[PDB]
Design an enzyme around this catalytic site. Structure first.
Site, mmCIF file in Angstrom:
data_model
loop_
_atom_site.group_PDB
_atom_site.id
_atom_site.type_symbol
_atom_site.label_atom_id
_atom_site.label_comp_id
_atom_site.label_asym_id
_atom_site.label_seq_id
_atom_site.Cartn_x
_atom_site.Cartn_y
_atom_site.Cartn_z
ATOM 1 N N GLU A 190 -113.186 -8.645 77.500
ATOM 2 C CA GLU A 190 -112.442 -9.787 76.886
ATOM 3 C C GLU A 190 -113.072 -10.121 75.547
ATOM 4 O O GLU A 190 -112.398 -10.032 74.492
ATOM 5 C CB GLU A 190 -112.484 -10.962 77.840
ATOM 6 C CG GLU A 190 -111.669 -10.659 79.091
ATOM 7 C CD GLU A 190 -111.156 -11.812 79.835
ATOM 8 O OE1 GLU A 190 -111.969 -12.731 80.172
ATOM 9 O OE2 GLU A 190 -109.922 -11.876 80.077
ATOM 10 N N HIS A 197 -117.056 -12.653 88.722
ATOM 11 C CA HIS A 197 -115.920 -11.720 88.733
ATOM 12 C C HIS A 197 -116.007 -10.855 87.487
ATOM 13 O O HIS A 197 -116.833 -11.104 86.622
ATOM 14 C CB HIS A 197 -114.601 -12.485 88.776
ATOM 15 C CG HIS A 197 -114.420 -13.348 87.582
ATOM 16 N ND1 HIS A 197 -114.902 -14.656 87.518
ATOM 17 C CD2 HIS A 197 -113.892 -13.095 86.364
ATOM 18 C CE1 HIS A 197 -114.640 -15.136 86.301
ATOM 19 N NE2 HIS A 197 -114.011 -14.183 85.581
ATOM 20 N N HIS A 204 -105.634 -11.450 90.838
ATOM 21 C CA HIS A 204 -105.952 -11.261 89.405
ATOM 22 C C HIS A 204 -107.212 -10.422 89.227
ATOM 23 O O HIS A 204 -107.253 -9.559 88.354
ATOM 24 C CB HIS A 204 -106.080 -12.641 88.768
ATOM 25 C CG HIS A 204 -104.845 -13.481 88.942
ATOM 26 N ND1 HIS A 204 -103.615 -13.174 88.345
ATOM 27 C CD2 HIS A 204 -104.687 -14.672 89.571
ATOM 28 C CE1 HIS A 204 -102.712 -14.091 88.665
ATOM 29 N NE2 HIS A 204 -103.347 -15.017 89.438
ATOM 30 N N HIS A 242 -118.406 -11.934 84.392
ATOM 31 C CA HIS A 242 -118.479 -13.397 84.182
ATOM 32 C C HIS A 242 -119.175 -14.043 85.396
ATOM 33 O O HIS A 242 -118.583 -14.034 86.480
ATOM 34 C CB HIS A 242 -117.088 -13.970 84.005
ATOM 35 C CG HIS A 242 -116.454 -13.568 82.712
ATOM 36 N ND1 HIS A 242 -115.095 -13.730 82.438
ATOM 37 C CD2 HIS A 242 -117.010 -13.035 81.603
ATOM 38 C CE1 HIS A 242 -114.843 -13.210 81.235
ATOM 39 N NE2 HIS A 242 -116.017 -12.865 80.679
ATOM 40 N N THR A 294 -110.633 -17.875 80.389
ATOM 41 C CA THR A 294 -109.780 -16.811 79.826
ATOM 42 C C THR A 294 -108.540 -16.578 80.676
ATOM 43 O O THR A 294 -107.731 -15.706 80.321
ATOM 44 C CB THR A 294 -110.533 -15.515 79.616
ATOM 45 O OG1 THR A 294 -110.836 -14.955 80.893
ATOM 46 C CG2 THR A 294 -111.782 -15.715 78.780
ATOM 47 N N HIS A 296 -113.537 -8.455 84.515
ATOM 48 C CA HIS A 296 -112.297 -8.080 83.837
ATOM 49 C C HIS A 296 -112.484 -6.611 83.439
ATOM 50 O O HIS A 296 -113.577 -6.244 82.988
ATOM 51 C CB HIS A 296 -112.015 -8.957 82.601
ATOM 52 C CG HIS A 296 -111.967 -10.415 82.907
ATOM 53 N ND1 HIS A 296 -110.782 -11.126 83.041
ATOM 54 C CD2 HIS A 296 -112.965 -11.322 83.072
ATOM 55 C CE1 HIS A 296 -111.085 -12.435 83.303
ATOM 56 N NE2 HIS A 296 -112.433 -12.609 83.331
HETATM 57 O O1 LIG Z 1 -110.872 -16.510 85.869
HETATM 58 C C1 LIG Z 1 -111.892 -17.064 86.394
HETATM 59 O O2 LIG Z 1 -112.337 -16.885 87.619
HETATM 60 C C2 LIG Z 1 -112.726 -17.970 85.505
HETATM 61 C C3 LIG Z 1 -113.184 -19.113 86.146
HETATM 62 C C4 LIG Z 1 -114.094 -19.950 85.540
HETATM 63 C C5 LIG Z 1 -114.562 -19.677 84.271
HETATM 64 C C6 LIG Z 1 -114.127 -18.558 83.586
HETATM 65 C C7 LIG Z 1 -113.156 -17.645 84.173
HETATM 66 SE SE1 LIG Z 1 -112.486 -16.396 82.966
HETATM 67 ZN ZN LIG Z 2 -113.478 -14.280 83.600
#
Ligand SMILES: O=C(O)c1ccccc1[SeH]
Ligand SMILES: [Zn+2]
EC number: 4.2.1.1
Length: 259
Positions: free
Chosen positions: A105, A93, A63, A118, A197, A95
């Site tokens: 996002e 990570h 992802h 994030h 998300t 997006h």
């Molecule tokens: O997709 C993820 O790695 C994730 C995990 C924890 C909090 C927010 C997110 Se958006």
């Molecule tokens: Zn995220």
């Protein structure tokens, strides 16, 4: 649940069938209407203490990619602002988009950024991440917008290892990475209660979205877009547009840390 993704047949409009909370009362991301967000003079100062952070590994999970930290002691912690207690950094990570005009996002007055970082933290009173995501105050996510312009020197170490985790399930050692190199000068923020998300879309997150974006170069974001969603020896699918669009705000207030 190995099935969901960002494609036509398994993307955000489909997630509610396996994850009904997708249509819940505190989903993320949201549009931040800057004119409606209210300054909250009661927010305490934000404390981002990354001096002792210990990065371990970088993983392509099919992802996105996660830069993972050692969260078995209080090494890299987030506290203050809207938060009660101490939240430990577990991973960051991004997006991002196929094009510079989309990828974030959260949006700001409907503005989309090229990407969004994030930094994920879990509330130490719940003992581990798996327990924390079951609680309405389990996680605190620091969200940072990326615009394309000047390079971010502190991101280059991430960019340069991406060739070694091209496909789903690949990991690489990733020690001594300092996430302070990804923070803008100002910690002015907006905050609201929301969710993951990505599936399972749990309503466990206190979102802290920084106002000031960071800048990355066209060459840096191009290397993100050369990653693959697929496994090795499967048909190549570029890892792009791994963002969920803005969800209904419903009965929530976005608070500003700044006048
Ligand atoms: O997709 C993820 O790695 C994730 C995990 C924890 C909090 C927010 C997110 Se958006
Ligand atoms: Zn995220």
């Amino acid at each position: 649940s190995h099935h969901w993704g960002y494609g036509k047949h398994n993307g955000p409009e489909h997630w509610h069938k396996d994850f009904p909370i997708a249509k819940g009362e505190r989903q993320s991301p949201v549009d931040i209407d800057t004119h409606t967000a209210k300054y909250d003079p009661s927010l305490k100062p934000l404390s981002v203490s990354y001096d002792q952070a210990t990065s371990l590994r970088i993983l392509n999970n099919g992802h996105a990619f996660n830069v993972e930290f050692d969260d078995s002691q209080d090494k890299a912690v987030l506290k203050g602002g809207p938060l009660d207690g101490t939240y430990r950094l577990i991973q960051f990570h991004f997006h991002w988009g196929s094009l510079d005009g989309q990828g974030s996002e959260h949006t700001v007055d409907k503005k989309k950024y090229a990407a969004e970082l994030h930094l994920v933290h879990w509330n130490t009173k719940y003992g581990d991440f798996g327990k924390a995501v079951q609680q309405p105050d389990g996680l605190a996510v620091l969200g940072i917008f990326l615009k394309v312009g000047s390079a971010k020197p502190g991101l280059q170490k991430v960019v340069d290892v991406l060739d070694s985790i091209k496909t789903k399930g690949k990991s690489a050692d990733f020690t001594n990475f300092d996430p302070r190199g990804l923070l803008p000068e100002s910690l002015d923020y907006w905050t609201y209660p929301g969710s993951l998300t990505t599936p399972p879309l749990l309503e466990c997150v206190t979102w802290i979205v920084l106002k000031e974006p960071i800048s990355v170069s066209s060459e840096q974001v191009l290397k993100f877009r050369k990653l693959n969603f697929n496994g090795e020896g499967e048909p190549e699918e570029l890892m792009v547009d791994n963002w969920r669009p803005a969800q209904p705000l419903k009965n929530r207030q976005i608070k500003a840390s700044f006048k």
